[PDB]
């Protein structure tokens, strides 16, 4: 279910990939959801979590690795962290 | 081993007590080389104009021992 909603969100809503794009969006406050891969470095996970709690944003720790998250996104590069600005047709924010 | 591009400071090092002798070099390409033996370094100054070299030479204090081309 989480994979399907993530796939639909990128086809409907707004999203940014990677670390610095995610970090900038949290800084601007437009970010609504944060996806963090399983093998994200522990310091990177905590600083993103601190950014999210400042910005009052939800955080989801994706069970699969960064490769798994990128494959679930369908792009052919590994993604460690992404920020969902808008859910669009998906309801990823509620669940 | 110390090239000096400033005339005054060449003069001042010449007046300084560490200075022991000065030397004059006249190269074939017509530039004048004022070398100043000091305690630790040898300060040399290259001048392209003869009359500036001459006025510099008379500007050296008399007590300094000046030697011509070796």
């Amino acid at each position: 279910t989480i994979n399907s909603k993530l796939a639909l969100t990128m086809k409907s809503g707004k999203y940014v990939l990677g670390y610095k794009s995610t970090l900038k969006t949290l800084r601007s406050g437009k970010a609504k959801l944060i996806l963090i891969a399983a093998n994200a470095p522990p310091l990177r996970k905590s600083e993103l979590e601190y950014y999210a709690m400042l910005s009052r944003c939800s955080v989801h720790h994706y069970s699969g690795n960064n490769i798994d998250l990128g494959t679930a996104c369908g792009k052919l590069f590994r993604v460690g962290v992404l920020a969902v600005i808008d859910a669009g047709d998906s309801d990823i924010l509620a669940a | 081993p110390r090239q000096i591009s400033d005339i005054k400071q060449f003069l001042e090092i010449a007046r300084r007590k560490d200075a022991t002798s000065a030397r004059i070099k006249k190269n074939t390409n017509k530039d004048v080389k004022f070398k100043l033996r000091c305690s630790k370094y040898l300060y040399t100054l290259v001048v392209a104009d003869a009359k500036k070299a001459e006025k510099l030479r008379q500007s050296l204090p008399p007590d300094l021992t000046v030697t011509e081309v070796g």
Partner: protein, 90 residues
């Protein structure tokens, strides 16, 4: 295909016997293969010495303890699972 069967063992030539070279072949392809790093996911883990597996990923640089020829062994994996279930029960 330069060599149909011998593979990496072609350096040893005709010596040491067929079976005594085939088991080296399986072990040697394991030993020199590149493994996916558990911490960064980049395929940058390579053996350093017997038991040492270093990640050359810029920013990861993590060293690992593992098997002599392969990063993870069956015995270590079984031990990790049994210890995990024992701790959860305890």
């Amino acid at each position: 295909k330069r060599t149909k069967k011998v593979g990496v063992t072609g350096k040893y030539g005709v010596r040491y016997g067929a079976s005594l070279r085939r088991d080296v072949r399986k072990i040697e392809v394991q030993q020199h293969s590149r493994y996916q790093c558990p911490f960064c996911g980049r395929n940058t883990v390579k053996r350093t010495a017997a038991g040492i597996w270093c990640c050359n990923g810029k920013g990861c640089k993590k060293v690992l303890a593992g098997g002599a020829w392969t990063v993870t062994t069956a015995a270590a994996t079984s031990a990790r699972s049994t210890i995990r279930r024992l701790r959860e029960m305890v």
